[PDB]
Swiss-Prot record, chain A:
Subcellular location: Secreted
PTM section of the record: There appear to be no free sulfhydryl groups.
Reported tissue expression: High levels in placenta and pregnancy serum. In placenta, expressed in X cells in septa and anchoring villi, and in syncytiotrophoblasts in the chorionic villi. Lower levels are found in a variety of other tissues including kidney, myometrium, endometrium, ovaries, breast, prostate, bone marrow, colon, fibroblasts and osteoblasts.
Induction or repression: By 8-bromoadenosine-3',5'-phosphate.
Gene responsible for this protein: PAPPA
Intrachain S-S bonds: 21-39
Role, per record: Metalloproteinase which specifically cleaves IGFBP-4 and IGFBP-5, resulting in release of bound IGF. Cleavage of IGFBP-4 is dramatically enhanced by the presence of IGF, whereas cleavage of IGFBP-5 is slightly inhibited by the presence of IGF.
Residues of the full protein shown: 1538 to 1617 of 1627
Similarity remark: Belongs to the peptidase M43B family.
Superkingdom classification of source: Eukaryota
Subunit structure: Homodimer; disulfide-linked. In pregnancy serum, predominantly found as a disulfide-linked 2:2 heterotetramer with the proform of PRG2.
Descriptive protein name: Pappalysin-1
Swiss-Prot record, chains B, C:
Covered residues, full protein: 44 to 211 of 302
UniProt similarity note: Belongs to the stanniocalcin family.
Keyword Signal: yes
Keyword Glycoprotein: yes
Subunit structure of this chain's protein: Homodimer; disulfide-linked.
Organism domain of life: Eukaryota
Tissue and organ distribution: Expressed in a variety of tissues including muscle, heart, pancreas, kidney, spleen, prostate, small intestine, colon and peripheral blood leukocytes.
Name the record gives this protein: Stanniocalcin-2
Gene of this entry: STC2
Alphabetized UniProt keyword annotations: Disulfide bond, Glycoprotein, Hormone, Phosphoprotein, Secreted, Signal
Any GO MF annotation of the entry: enzyme binding
Species, as recorded: Homo sapiens
GO biological process: one example: intracellular calcium ion homeostasis
Annotated function: Has an anti-hypocalcemic action on calcium and phosphate homeostasis.
GO cellular component terms given for this protein: endoplasmic reticulum; endoplasmic reticulum lumen; extracellular space; Golgi apparatus; perinuclear region of cytoplasm
């Protein structure tokens, strides 16, 4: 919404498009892209306590269970 | 001819293993019926689903879920004979593939599936046989690429045997 | 990549086991090179040697003698590489079959040679592949009968796979 100062607010230069996360949140598939605070940390697919199966399967399995596919949700009991 | 203890342990695995993952098809391996590669199917295609596009990932997840769920549910009062087991496994595979549009997803990723398919894999297991049989029925360009690939690896591992079997 | 102790035991065979009889070919099996079926080759052919006619018996005796003698003598400077082993074995098979007139015995015992060939054994072992390759160039009627037989067993053992491989 442009203000009265003849400048766009928020400024388009300050705004940028970042690749989003896949619709795989909450599918029990722990992919690194969805495992972010931006989208519910993959809906809990990357934390064992959060996933409804109570076991995390990385997608693909080559992803390290302690790397980007590790439980990144602080609210999870594993972080506690 | 499947052993009764084998039947008990497979049904225990199925009631224990969830829909997602290789757990359903992991126990199905090492059975008396010698239908192998199911664990290999899950392992390799979950390796390579990332190489598949987004629609490919959706299709592969849907197909894995369909296979696990249906093969668990319909594993009921089938006779002890292995040929019936192989027939129903092939039927479930083809049913999940047709209901989840294997053909177009394969068309979008012909090169990837060419990469996974191996001459030894088709020589060893009937599941991959069913997959490639349906693949040759999923698009003229797709079937042509699959034929080229299978000829390449078949002649690589067979030499003149592949040519003499492929008469014309 | 053949094992050195395997080389020692196989040369102990050749220096001890006489050419007449399958014992030489008995212990060629279980090698690291996985070139199998020589046990099956010699057992099957000597079992069916009686079914072979007098010319067939003469040919099979001559071919067995040639195979034993040549594989004993030419097993010298051959490299440790298993593909080289298979390659020289193929040349020995070809020579023994061509200079002992296999094709005429094929005409005289078309039904018999159809009887021995089993699709599983053809798939498993290279020497049967070499035999059928030479069979398809040992007589129009014989090659036609061999193609019909291999198609029959191929279909009955592989389902639609046989038509999948046989585009034509
Ligand atoms: Ca996910």
């Amino acid at each position: 919404v442009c203000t009265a100062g003849l400048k766009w607010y928020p400024h388009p230069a300050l705004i940028h498009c970042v690749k989003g996360c896949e619709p795989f949140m909450g599918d029990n598939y722990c992919d690194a892209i969805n495992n972010r605070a931006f989208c519910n940390y993959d809906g809990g697919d990357c934390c064992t306590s959060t996933v409804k199966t109570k076991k995390v399967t990385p997608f693909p399995m080559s992803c390290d269970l302690q790397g980007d596919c590790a439980c990144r949700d602080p609210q999870a009991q594993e972080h506690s | 001819r499947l052993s009764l203890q084998n039947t008990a342990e497979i049904q225990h695995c199925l009631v224990n293993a969830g829909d997602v993952g290789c757990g359903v098809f992991e126990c199905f391996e090492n059975n008396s019926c010698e239908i192998r590669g199911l664990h290999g199917i899950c392992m390799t295609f979950l390796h390579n689903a990332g190489k598949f596009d987004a629609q490919g990932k959706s299709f592969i997840k849907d197909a894995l879920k369909c296979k696990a769920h249906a093969l668990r549910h319909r594993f009921g009062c089938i006779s002890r004979k292995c040929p019936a087991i192989r027939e129903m496994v092939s039927q479930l595979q083809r049913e999940c593939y047709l209901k989840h549009d294997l053909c177009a997803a394969a068309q979008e990723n012909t090169r990837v599936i060419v990469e996974m398919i191996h001459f030894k894999d088709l020589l060893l297991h009937e599941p991959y046989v069913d997959l490639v049989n349906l693949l040759l029925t999923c698009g003229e360009e797709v079937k042509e690429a699959i034929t080229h690939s299978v000829q390449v690896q078949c002649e690589q591992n067979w030499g003149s045997l592949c040519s003499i079997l492929s008469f014309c």
